[PDB]
């Protein structure tokens, strides 16, 4: 909201100060990758 102003009780996160005084936000978890790379000790069973 913005006090002294009738435009109040809206939703969203403002662009005025999105950090809320914090140096950073963090999100942590697992990473699962399937990539294509060279091959070694192969050409047979």
């Amino acid at each position: 909201s913005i006090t002294r102003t009738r435009v109040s009780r809206l939703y969203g996160l403002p662009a005025a100060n999105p950090n809320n005084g914090k140096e950073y936000y963090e999100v942590a978890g697992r990473f699962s990758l399937i990539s294509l790379v060279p091959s070694n000790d192969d050409y047979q069973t």
Partner: protein
Amino acid sequence: MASLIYRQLLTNSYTVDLSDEIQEIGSTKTQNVTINLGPFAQTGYAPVN
């Protein structure tokens, strides 16, 4: 002897029938060939949309 070979051909003529029986029966009771795949794995692309 050298005519015994003709006599032997005649005598053993019966095996023609056994060979025909082989030819006709094996082709009805043959097992489907299964391939040994290569040492690689035939990978390609992923499902692209």
